């Protein structure tokens with residue numbers, strides 16, 4: 283209980299292998315993230331994933347400090363992730379954005395800070411800046427300079443570990459090859475589930491001792507207009523539903539356990555007390571090789587989150603094969 | 605260095621996934637055991653595996669206490685395993701054997717106690733009792749009764765968890781189907797390596813929430829007469845050597861990593877300070893799907909430890925398919 287399952291990252295820190303997702307669609311009020319994160323900690327989640335752009339870090343920070351102050355957990359046993367939004371990729375703005383997140387959290391450091399998405403937009407107060415014709419104002423930024431600035435955040439102790447999200451093979455290579463590289467990314471957080479299992483990019487990341495962290499592992503929030511409402515619903519999949527019945531679990535738990543067995547650190551968002559608790563059952567059963575092969579067979583090239591609002595610049599990550 | 609990778613067992617306890625093997629052939633002085641377990645703890649091993657029959661518990665116990673007393677580690681961060689030898693299967697001899705191990709160790713409890721080998725031999729003080737012409741004297745003991753005595757040792761707090769070693773499918777079912785079963789075995793510790801990968805037994809264990817723990821994962825001690833001197837040397841395999849070269853590791857480290865990635869808890873014995881430290885590097889890289897498949901391909905029905913001196917009784921575990 284005072285113990286939990288973690289993986290060693292390439293900088294020597296440890297990451298719990300089940301993480302709590304905190305993004306909620308625009309219609310959901312704030313008090314909701316506060317209570318959900320408390321419940322998550324209560325249930326046994328020790329890894330909590332957020333971002334500046336989720337507009338919840340005040341509530342998330344409060345939940346974590348509340349659970350430390352009530353004695354449920356110590357700060358050392360919470361692994362909190364934040365992410366740098368694309369209007370702060372300029373290296374002059376990286377540390378201020380991190381300090382801005384720490385101030386909202388009222389925490390002294392994050393355990394992990396990520397580059398949220400590799401397409402940069404113009405700096406300023408708008409998170410999606412637009413021109414007088416409604417066109418997104420993209421910015422030309424060298425992400426190797428952004429990386430340098432993230433490395434100095436780790437040196438300052440403001441982020442214990444640094445990594446990336448939504449990077450493809452070419453963009454990881456660009457960082458791993460950077461002149462004067464000090465710290466590799468510990469992770470690449472990307473969409474990953476049995477309809478899009480990312481085996482090629484997963485193998486690339488394993489070959490470089492980068493951990494792949496899976497978001498939308500339950501099929502995503504399905505929030506319009508980010509996700510099309512006619513994409514297939516992952517947790518309705520017949521093979522997952524059959525395995526869940528066989529195991530007396532649930533399709534979600536099957537989807538979660540698949541990732542754990544393939545060496546993926548898996549996130550799961552739920553703001554529902556029963557499902558938050560149910561998701562921790564991932565550690566209570568195992569899948570056989572034939573079950574794991576049946577789930578591998580489900581891959582169908584369904585990307586829920588294409589984020590094509592950001593397509594056009596060379597750093598848009600999803601037009602490459604991987 | 606206060607975190608480390610563990611798996612949850614079916615009784616709620618946690619087992620670190622790399623364990624330090626302490627058996628050495630007769631010719632090696634027992635002082636090497638004391639020194640080796642101190643090095644292993646110093647290198648970051650938190651799981652230590654021994655047995656009454658290894659004749660080293662006085663030394664292993666002293667190593668553990670020496671590292672507790674020096675402030676290196678706390679008792680709650682060592683996972684210590686002992687095993688019940690076959691001269692003590694009669695239920696009335698199970699607790700006296702556990703107490704005898706605890707007195708030799710000077711510990712108040714083991715974290716794990718296993719039935720070492722399912723064939724029983726005549727009770728008394730010899731661990732391999734022989735007749736007038738040097739033949740083993742076997743005994744007829746109902747392992748379900750043995751198991752009940754094991755459950756009472758767990759209830760007494762003298763073993764935090766209980767499990768088995770060298771059990772096959774049939775023998776595990778015997779236990780799982782016993783009327784009145786209180787505690788399933790948490791594990792089945794068996795020979796496991798790329799030449800004998802146990803995929804059938806491993807799948808069955810995963811389906812029953814039992815963790816398979818691999819011994820002889822580096823290809824065994826190769827001690828004669830227990831291991832056929834003509835059997836192939838695991839760590840000379842060209843697939844393992846090629847993956848070690850690709851990874852800038854060693855064939856031993858590839859064999860260890862393979863087990864971690866298939867959900868097996870792996871032991872490694874070394875009494876060499878350099879190799880003890882090297883073996884912990886298992887947490888510093890990852891194998892790709894392609895490399896895992898290539899290692900899967902090596903399976904070749906080579907069992908180093910046939911233990912065929914115990915063949916004949918029906919509980920001899922290695923005749924069955926799995």
Ligand SMILES: NC(=O)c1ccc[n+]([C@@H]2O[C@H](COP(=O)([O-])OP(=O)(O)OC[C@H]3O[C@@H](n4cnc5c(N)ncnc54)[C@H](OP(=O)(O)O)[C@@H]3O)[C@@H](O)[C@H]2O)c1
Pocket residue numbers: 302303304305306331332398447448471472496497498499500501502503504517532534535549550551552553554557558560561
């Ligand atoms: N790096 C990035 O770009 C990025 C972008 C997106 C997201 N993320 C991170 O990844 C997290 C997870 O991804 P996601 O937000 O898309 O959602 P997800 O985890 O795939 O969850 C999808 C949905 O599953 C439901 N659910 C959860 N547990 C369940 C269970 N046991 N049974 C049935 N349904 C269940 C949730 O509804 P209820 O809440 O009603 O349970 C939720 O709406 C995010 O919250 C965020 O922290 C990162």
Ligand SMILES: NC(=O)c1ccc[n+]([C@@H]2O[C@H](COP(=O)([O-])OP(=O)(O)OC[C@H]3O[C@@H](n4cnc5c(N)ncnc54)[C@H](OP(=O)(O)O)[C@@H]3O)[C@@H](O)[C@H]2O)c1
Pocket residue numbers: 624625626627628653654720769770793794818819820821822823824825826839854856857871872873874875876879880882883
């Ligand atoms: N349950 C049971 O029936 C059972 C029976 C047998 C054993 N076991 C348990 O499992 C343990 C391990 O099995 P094992 O004793 O057969 O041996 P093992 O772990 O397969 O292999 C040990 C041999 O490998 C060498 N070695 C270790 N690390 C190495 C490296 N990095 N590179 C090259 N060589 C390396 C050791 O030599 P050095 O020492 O010289 O380094 C030794 O010669 C035992 O010690 C015991 O704790 C259980």
Ligand SMILES: C[C@]12CCC(=O)C=C1CC[C@@H]1[C@@H]2CC[C@]2(C)C(=O)CC[C@@H]12
Pocket residue numbers: 305335336409410508587589
């Ligand atoms: C990152 C994000 C949330 C998590 C998710 O899954 C999908 C998106 C895509 C667009 C982001 C959005 C969060 C809020 C943003 C910044 C806006 O206010 C307009 C664009 C939008």
Ligand SMILES: C[C@]12CCC(=O)C=C1CC[C@@H]1[C@@H]2CC[C@]2(C)C(=O)CC[C@@H]12
Pocket residue numbers: 627657658731732830909
């Ligand atoms: C059980 C054992 C240890 C670990 C291992 O690898 C397998 C063996 C070989 C046979 C056992 C031995 C321990 C020493 C034994 C018990 C004797 O005193 C005569 C037979 C011999």
